[model samples]
Target chain A: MPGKKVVARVAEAYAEDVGKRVVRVDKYERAKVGVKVGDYVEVKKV
Target chain B: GKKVVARVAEAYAEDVGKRVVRVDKYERAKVGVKVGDYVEVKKV
Candidate 1:
């Protein structure tokens, strides 16, 4: 049950996404963390 | 400052896969981590 969150390798997003306020991840990761699409998430580096 | 946060999406680059994420400029700088590094994503 240690999947409330996940750490992922970072990759540059498309330039077209410049004005977008979003973080994209694999669908598996999103489902594992129960992070609904379009919801604000706590994304950080540590 | 509440913290650097971002909205979630499912639009990875054409070659992206598991355990990888796509982060844009403003949020990347705000969070202080660049490409090829690791970042934590949590839903709250």
Candidate 2:
């Protein structure tokens, strides 16, 4: 695994309406996280 | 005007020539189609 790190958070209407959340991340950050639009990303609540 | 509907799917490098990013639609209903809540069009 490429190290367990919290990448981005699902936000905007995607979270509210369709549960398709988002987080504003740069291209490099997104690449580092290695996630996609419809993929299920593991998120932890604090 | 004309338009196309799609959703972002994948991401990759742009230099070496690969699949890069893939755009596709979500499991949404558009009368008879699946899509998201956004649309884009160009005056053609």
Candidate 3:
């Protein structure tokens, strides 16, 4: 099953292409925002 | 680097063990909150 996800700021952005935006985060950061690895997170353009 | 654009409705969180805030489209559009230049996302 899919894990839980959370909404928070992007601590570090890995890729930012025209049609793609992948990121890499750690446990601390994910926990801070209530997100997990299996979960799907949405990134906004702040 | 080039700038990135995101959909107002797509910026949100899901249910998980951690504590996350659910920013709906209405509030998101109004507040205009976007993902900061980082690897993580904090609710504050």
Candidate 4:
């Protein structure tokens, strides 16, 4: 059961870590993204 | 000194097909979300 979820910014807007950067996420199951610069993520992970 | 302990998280697993896996990794979700920090329960 693969689905997408939101990883919204709790602070500000500015994403420096992108393109194959391993980050510590709250829900780091498959392909989970931690946060971004004032942006909510609806991403998928395997 | 009185040690004040507050209840935070409860363990929940996301069921995928036949396998049940953990959803929230950090302890307090936006806080820690660690493995086996609290009680494992079911939610609907």
Candidate 5:
């Protein structure tokens, strides 16, 4: 789990995101969390 | 030019691989589709 996590598109490992488990964060959104694709984020729900 | 759509039934096959994403009932219905459905994963 990420300390300052954001709800992202918890998608399957596909395309460029496949095998990497990378989250695709746009420039604007990444700036919101101070993160990028290589950075890790907690994905979860209730 | 291009768009991104996530398969909401595949976060590890959704509840469970590849080529997809998962959004719960909240995000799911937000797209107006059923299980294994996809929502706009990109912006204009």
Candidate 6:
């Protein structure tokens, strides 16, 4: 079983209708590891 | 806008957690939630 992972909220974003609102980063400081320890660094698309 | 951050740690004796079957995932070929997706949780 996967042990407990640290989850933290780091950033935020606001949007209307539908868009990409979820923010994640590479786990080991890379660009592939999904999930992060911050709220999110939301990058929205219009 | 304003925000607050606090840290608190508590220890409990004989602490136990329960696991209940829930529809935590979408029933599509692909999961609606990703590894880094922030989901909307309804308040009780």
**Which one wins on lDDT?**
1
Q: Write the per-residue lDDT of candidate 4 for residues B1-44, one digit (tens) a residue.
A: 11111121211232222222232322234333333332221111
lDDT of 6 at B12: 21
Worst 10 residues of 2 chain B by lDDT: B35-44
Give the per-residue Cα lDDT of candidate 3 at B31: 41
Q: For each candidate, what is chain B's TM-score?
A: 0.68, 0.23, 0.33, 0.20, 0.44, 0.26
A1-46 per-residue lDDT for model 6 (tens digits): 2544223322222222113322223233211223234333222111
Best by DockQ, which number? 1
How good is model 6 by TM-score?
Answer: 0.20
lDDT of 6 at A5: 29
Clash pairs (backbone) in predicted model 4: A13-A37, A14-A37, A31-A45, B25-B33, B26-B32, B26-B33, B26-B34, B27-B32, B27-B33, B27-B34
lDDT, candidates in the order shown: 0.75, 0.29, 0.37, 0.25, 0.38, 0.22
Residue A29's lDDT in candidate 5? 46
| 2 versus 6: better TM-score goes to | 2
Provide candidate 1's TM-score on chain A: 0.70
Choose 1 or 4, whichever is better by TM-score. Answer: 1
Q: Work out the iRMS of candidate 6.
A: 14.5
lDDT tens readout by residue for model 3, A1-46:
2444344443222224222333344455455556554454544443
Clashing residue pairs found in predicted model 1: none
What lDDT score goes with residue A43 in model 2?
26
Summarize candidate 1's per-residue lDDT along B1-44 as a digit string, tens digits. Answer: 12467788776557456587788878888888888978877887
Residue-wise C-alpha lDDT for candidate 1, range A3-31, written one tens digit per residue: 34477888888787776877877677787
Which ranges in model 1 have alpha carbons more than 4 Å from their true place?
Answer: A1-5, B13-16
Residue B38 lDDT (model 3): 22
lDDT of 2 by residue, B1-44 (tens): 12233333333333113212222222222212222223221111
lDDT of 6 at B36: 33
Using alpha carbons, what is the TM-score of model 4? Answer: 0.16
Deviation in Å, model 5, residue A7 alpha carbon: 3.5
Better of 5 and 6 by DockQ: 5
- TM-scores, in order shown? 0.80, 0.26, 0.31, 0.16, 0.34, 0.20
